[PDB]
Amino acid sequence: AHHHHHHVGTQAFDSTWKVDRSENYDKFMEKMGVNIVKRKLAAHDNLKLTITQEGNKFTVKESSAFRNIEVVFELGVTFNYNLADGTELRGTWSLEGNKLIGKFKRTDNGNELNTVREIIGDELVQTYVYEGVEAKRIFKKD
Numbered sequence: 001a002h003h004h005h006h007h008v009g010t011q012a013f014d015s016t017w018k019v020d021r022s023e024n025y026d027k028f029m030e031k032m033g034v035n036i037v038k039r040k041l042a043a044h045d046n047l048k049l050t051i052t053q054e055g056n057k058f059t060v061k062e063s064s065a066f067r068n069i070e071v072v073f074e075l076g077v078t079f080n081y082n083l084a085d086g087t088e089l090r091g092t093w094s095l096e097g098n099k100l101i102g103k104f105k106r107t108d109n110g111n112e113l114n115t116v117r118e119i120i121g122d123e124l125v126q127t128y129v130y131e132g133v134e135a136k137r138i139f140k141k142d
């Protein structure tokens, strides 16, 4: 007696999507209290994203008009992330039920930010909620 068989797959998110559009971002940056100049480049930064994962550890490369760095996280591993000005927040991402959670909190007053990751049709999306305001950026393959 004997038998055999085989198949194959291929992830979807593991791609290179660049900022093709955004929604409500204006209120998000305005909320924090960003200056006209800071809102000029942070709006037309041309964020280029590259998604690559190997297990429960994801690594994405992001580049902007004034800088660019690579970040690495782990599902369910809280770590300290620093900002361009030096602020350090304690946050990360973790899946729940059938959705992905992303939360980070300021050290000043503990402002809780909430972000979820999803994909619609042929465009990647990431939502961010700040004080009731829910803004998101739509990245299309580059």
Ligand SMILES: CCCCCCCC/C=C\CCCCCCCC(=O)O
Pocket: 038, 042, 066, 073, 081, 083, 084, 093, 102, 104
């Ligand atoms: C020059 C103006 C100040 C720059 C504004 C910073 C805007 C965001 C840029 C870098 C910080 C990004 C922090 C994201 C945390 C991880 C979330 C994720 O896994 O997608």
